[PDB]
Structures are given as C-alpha cells and as structure tokens.
Ligand binder design. Structure first.
Ligand code: ZSW
Ligand code: ZSW
Ligand code: THR
Ligand code: THR
Ligand code: CL
Ligand code: CL
Lengths: 149, 149
C-alpha cells in the first residue's frame, strides 16, 4: 500500500478542489479547478505520478473512472485506475472529515491571500506538516523509503 | 542537505519553465508559466513547500531574491531564501545539462500532448523515474527518510 492513492473532489466558493490522498499516510496534494473534467483529472494525475510513486488510484466517481482522457493519462503514467467504492465503510467518513478539516484551514488562511488557489496550497501545507507524533509528510516518506528497501 | 533546493528558469516555445531541483538527489518539480514574475515564483514555492520539507531555496536570479512577493511566500512557508551564486562552478554546468536533458525529453514527448504544460509534466515524470542504480525519486525519499530518523 505505499503506492495507493484516493481521489476526492470537494467544492468551495463556486470552484472545485481536487484532492489526492495517500491512503496509508493521509498526505495530500490538491489543486483548484473551475470544474471537474476528464482533462483536469488526467492532468492532475500526471503531475502526481511524476512526483510520487503512484501505483493505484481509487478514482472519485464513475465519470472519471470511465473517462478515456483519464484512462489515457493513467496508461501513460503507469497508474492502475480503480474504482473508489467504499467497501470499507470507514473510508467515506475519513474523506468527509478530511474535507471538513481542509475547509476549516482554508477559512483560517482565507484572509492571507486574494485567490482561493493560494489558500488551498496553504491548507495543503498546514495539513501535511501537522503533527498528530509524526506529520503526514513524514509518514509518506517513511512508508515509501521502507518500500524501496 | 535534505532540505536544500535550487530554482531554475528555462525557456521553450515562447514560454517559461520554472524548475525546482532538490540538490542532493536531482529530483525535480516544474511548471510552465507565461513569464517569470514574483507572484508566479511565490506560488510555485508555496506549492513545493507544502509537498516536501523545503528548508532553503537558492533563488534563480536577483529579481526573485529581491521580490517582496517571493520573500512573503518564503516567510509564510518557513523557507530560507538564499542567493544562487555558483560558488562551486560545477553548479552552472549541472543546471545547464539538466535544462538540456529536460528539453530533449520534452521533444521526445512533444507529440503525445497538445499543450506544452502536459509535455513538461511528462518530462518531470521521466526525469524523476530514470534509473541512473536508483532514480532521483528514490534518492530524495531515502535522503529525507534518513533525515527524519
Ligand atoms: C483530450 C485530451 C487532451 N490530450 C489528448 C492528446 C492530444 C494530443 C496527443 C496526445 C493526447 C493524449 O491523449 N495524450 C496522452 C496519451 C496522455 C497525456 C492530453 C491532455 C490531457 C490533459 C491535459 C492536456 C492534454 C494535452 O493534450 O496537452 O493539456 C493540459 C490540460 C490542462 C488541464 C485542463 O486544462 O483541463 O490537461
Ligand atoms: C502580490 C501578491 C499576491 N498576494 C498578496 C497578498 C494579498 C492578500 C493577502 C495576503 C497577501 C500575501 O502577501 N500573502 C502571503 C503572506 C504570501 C502567500 C499573495 C499571492 C501570491 C502569489 C499568488 C497569489 C497570491 C494571492 O494573493 O492569492 O495568487 C495566485 C497566484 C498564482 C500565480 C500567478 O498567477 O502569478 O500566486
Ligand atoms: C521491499 C524491499 N525494499 C525490496 O525491494
Ligand atoms: C536525524 C535523526 N533522525 C534525528 O532527528
Ligand atoms: Cl512536509
Ligand atoms: Cl517517482
């Protein structure tokens, strides 16, 4: 499970925040996009896979799962595209709690930037650095390093 | 050493490719921007620091070093903003060769995407995964994990 990520789409301020969560660590990357499209999702995954060793992505919905644009990016980047069915019911709850936390952080920083995209990157920073004790940023590096060995 | 990054700005197709290089590993992140401005550079560094434990950035030129927008982002993200003077003359050479490699890879993928930004992300992926043996992606994780311990 060092290579497993989950896609998550949440909404704020009439815009869409696309999030990828590293399941084992809770580490995240995120971007603000005007709307979720196959193209936006494909480009996001391409970026993610160039930066971390992405083996599997649990897609956030059936449209992205079906999208030939998304499938082409997953093919290119060597990603196994999977469904995101919450067979473990706790995954729904975890994602919802993450979305709430992220929105809370965005509110806390919202005044320190004009644009939502900036606030979202500040939220990513705070989330990844927060010690819960290790941070999610520390956990992901440790998990992957262990795997490489 | 685990936290040192170098900024690098290169040009292609009338656009600017802003690159951050993790000096110890040769791992990179990059983006295409219309022009290098303080705001573009500040936003890039904010993203980078939310994703990796960025301690020090060697800025790519005096304008970004001076920029109060860049300084404000470095303050926010806890980054030590430094000059990028190549006291070790091998630095210029390494960056020049990296820029050449990246442009080579971009040409090799250029037909697999309509937009330069896509080709640049493909180039990041190829660069970071290339075994030279370990890849740059493996080296950065190993270096930081060693630091965390
Ligand atoms: C209809 C899809 C368009 N492309 C089809 C394509 C066109 C020409 C050649 C190959 C391919 C192709 O399938 N390529 C390989 C196999 C997979 C990468 C690929 C693509 C995807 C997402 C993007 C892109 C681009 C682009 O063509 O550059 O451009 C930036 C855009 C930014 C996000 C946003 O604006 O939504 O995200
Ligand atoms: C003139 C600078 C602008 N801002 C000044 C600002 C305005 C209001 C409140 C605080 C601050 C402030 O200094 N904040 C803290 C201390 C530092 C983050 C900050 C900023 C920087 C880069 C960006 C931004 C934004 C933004 O205001 O959101 O928006 C997206 C843009 C995308 C790249 C591009 O388009 O160039 O990069
Ligand atoms: C797992 C172990 N590092 C091999 O490869
Ligand atoms: C370095 C060591 N892991 C301490 O902290
Ligand atoms: Cl971090
Ligand atoms: Cl990688």
């Amino acid at each position: 499970s060092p290579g497993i990520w989950q896609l998550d789409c949440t909404h704020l301020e009439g815009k869409v925040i696309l999030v990828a969560v590293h399941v084992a660590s809770g580490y995240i990357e995120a971007e603000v996009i005007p709307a979720e499209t196959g193209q936006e999702t494909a480009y996001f995954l391409l970026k993610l896979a160039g930066r971390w060793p992405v083996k599997t992505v649990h897609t956030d919905n059936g449209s992205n799962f079906t999208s030939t644009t998304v499938k082409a990016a997953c093919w290119w980047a060597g990603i196994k595209q999977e469904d995101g069915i919450p067979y473990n019911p706790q995954s729904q709850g975890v994602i919802e709690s993450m979305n709430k936390e992220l929105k809370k952080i965005i509110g806390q920083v919202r005044d320190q930037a004009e644009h939502l995209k900036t606030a979202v990157q500040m939220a990513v920073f705070i989330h990844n650095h927060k010690r819960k004790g290790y941070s999610a940023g520390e956990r992901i590096v440790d998990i992957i390093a262990t795997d490489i060995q």
